[PDB]
Amino acid sequence: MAKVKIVGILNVTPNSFHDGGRFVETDKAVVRARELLSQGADIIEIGGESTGPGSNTITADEELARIVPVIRAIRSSLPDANIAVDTYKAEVARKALELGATMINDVSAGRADPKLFGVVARSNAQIVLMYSKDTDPHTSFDERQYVDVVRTVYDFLAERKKAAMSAGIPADRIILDTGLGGFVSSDPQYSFQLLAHLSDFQDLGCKLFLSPSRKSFLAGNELLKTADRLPGTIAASAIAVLHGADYIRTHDVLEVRRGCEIATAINQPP
Amino acid sequence: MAKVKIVGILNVTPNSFHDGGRFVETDKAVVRARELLSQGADIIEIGGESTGPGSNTITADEELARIVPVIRAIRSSLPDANIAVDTYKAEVARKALELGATMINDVSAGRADPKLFGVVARSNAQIVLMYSKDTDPHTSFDERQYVDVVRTVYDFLAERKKAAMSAGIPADRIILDTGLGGFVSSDPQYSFQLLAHLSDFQDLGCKLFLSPSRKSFLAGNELLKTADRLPGTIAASAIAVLHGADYIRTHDVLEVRRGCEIATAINQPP
Ligand SMILES: Nc1nc(O)c2nc(CNc3ccc(C(=O)O)cc3)cnc2n1
Ligand SMILES: Nc1nc(O)c2nc(CNc3ccc(C(=O)O)cc3)cnc2n1
Questions:
Q1: d(CA B233, CA B254)
Q2: Is A14 in contact with A25 (CB distance < 8 Å)?
Q3: Which residue, among B210, B266, B267, would best test binding to A if mutated, counting the most A CBs under 10 Å from its CB?
Q4: Which residues of A touch B6 (CB under 8 A)?
Q5: Beta pairing partners, B47
Q6: Which three-class secondary structure state does DSSP give residue A44?
Q7: Which of these, A91, B50, B234, B254, is most buried using a 10 Å CB contact count?
């Protein structure tokens, strides 16, 4: 059984407000991609629009203005790099694929932009379909309750896979993500239940993709801030791999790679 | 489902027994004990004789000269702390129990000293019986092979539990440890198989105790040295808890506690 593919998060978020222009943010992104690769990332995932807590929506033009220089610079300086883009906007995905990205990660599962499925279908790229409790990726993180969150998410992902296939994406280019954290509920129990039952989602026939990545459900009893959730991220990501994850999305490539290697080894027979 | 109990390692083997100082400074050990407690250790485990790579045997007299001052200082400045002692020697355990230790951790599983079982039986302390491929804790770490390491270790622990009980120790005071790292084999695959099948040991009726703690089986494909094994230790300890460990022994108390809390949460039913 194979190693997990580590997806290193590269957020392009211009919020410094100083004398330097867009080039400073682009240069920051390139140094960060080099570091992620140094730490053993298999894939560099570029995102121009945060969907974390308290985030809001940007225009497609602003999102392209952020990620296009970055993709260009990484492709030229690091041509071996495997590039993914985190976007739910068809116009953003189309340009990113033309510039050499090979993976599109859609937190809306193709629901925010009905044209995105066709953009990926006409390419050679893979698509990540993630479960979210609402169609809008920037909905507030309410305390959503579930009678059976595993069944709810499973039925959702089955439906979205069938829609992606009807739009022309073959099953072997579809990757599935249960969602975690606020995407599921501000109540952490449901994220833990998806992690406990993650192997069930292998019956949909698709590779699995997870992003524990210091999310709110890892706050624990101490209600840890983001900066203190690295131990919890390592544990959650290792257990996800133990239960079938093929991709792990993370800010902390070195540590999460090494932790998930242990999970992979525990999964091996003699 | 209860939290794991975190056993914080306080090893007071001196830097260089023969070349430098004969003992550690007692106040520095107390400082470390206070940090382990403040990081969330439930138990402080004092040991005067190390058993990792290349360790040296020491006499019972010298072992007492190491741990007695440190136990006395901790019981005076931290009387609420739970004390365990890591020793395979009956005369060390006897004095440790007199001074208030409530758990004896024996890496020989009661084999190295025929009197140890009886000393523990005449106390109210718990005893940890760990599997090792050889009785002598300082045996070199050979590449021991197994046809079925789970079966071998299971039958060993069943036999040591029966021996402890024959010596008057009740089953509800017996704690079992599969061993990890060189205690099992210099081949890491056998330590991963024990972790993968740890739930098989719940048939024995005893709480389970594990010490991933930056051991050699966490070296991975990079053949990481001790300093780089914290992520793997978090992942292995978390997975051990997910698979039924009741105690986790570590010197990285803060991080391993937080990671293991995630494993406990994933184990909880809706
Ligand atoms: N495929 C996939 N899977 C994710 O889990 C994901 N998460 C984020 C970032 N969004 C969040 C959402 C919630 C939280 C919190 O509750 O803390 C944090 C970050 C962005 N892209 C993502 N893509
Ligand atoms: N109950 C229990 N369980 C242990 O696992 C343990 N380990 C050590 C320390 N000994 C070792 C042995 C092997 C290795 C390596 O291969 O790296 C490292 C340290 C000391 N007390 C212990 N007690």
A1: 12
A2: yes
A3: B266
A4: none
A5: B11, B86
A6: strand
A7: B234
Experimental structure resolution, Å? 1.8
Q: At what angle do helices B230-242 and B253-266 cross, to 10 degrees?
A: 30
Q: Which among A189, A228, A235 has CB closest to B263?
A: A235
The tokens of A104 are what?
Answer: 């599109």
Length of chain A: 270
Those residues whose C-beta lies under 8 Å from the C-beta of residue B101, and which sit 6 or more positions away, are B46, B71, B83, B84, B85, B93, B125
- Looking up tokens 């495997």 gives A82
Please work out whether the CB of residue B128 comes within 6 Å of at least one atom of ligand 2: yes
Residues 138-157 of A with CB under 8 A from B: 148
Task: Report the amino acid identity of residue A167.
Answer: A
In whole angstroms, what is the distance from residue A109 CA to residue A204 CA? 15
What residues pair up with A46 in beta bridges, in sequence order? Answer: A10, A85
Tokens of A59: 């225009």
H/E/C letters for each residue in B221-250?
Answer: CCCCCHHHCHHHHHHHHHHHHHCCCCEEEE
Contact A99, A75 (CB under 8 A): yes
Cβ atoms of A260 and A252 within 8 Å: the answer is no
B114 touches chain A (CB under 8 A): no
Q: Which two tokens stand for residue A42?
A: 């298999």
Please answer whether residues B216 and B141 qualify as being in contact, where contact means their C-beta atoms are separated by less than 8 angstroms.
Answer: yes
**Nearest CB neighbour to B192, from listed A148, A238, A266:** A266
Domain boundaries, chain A: 1-270
Find out whether A117 and A167 touch, Cβ atoms under 8 Å. Answer: yes
CA distance B222 to B27: 38
Say yes or no: CB of residue B105 within 6 Å of ligand 2. Answer: yes
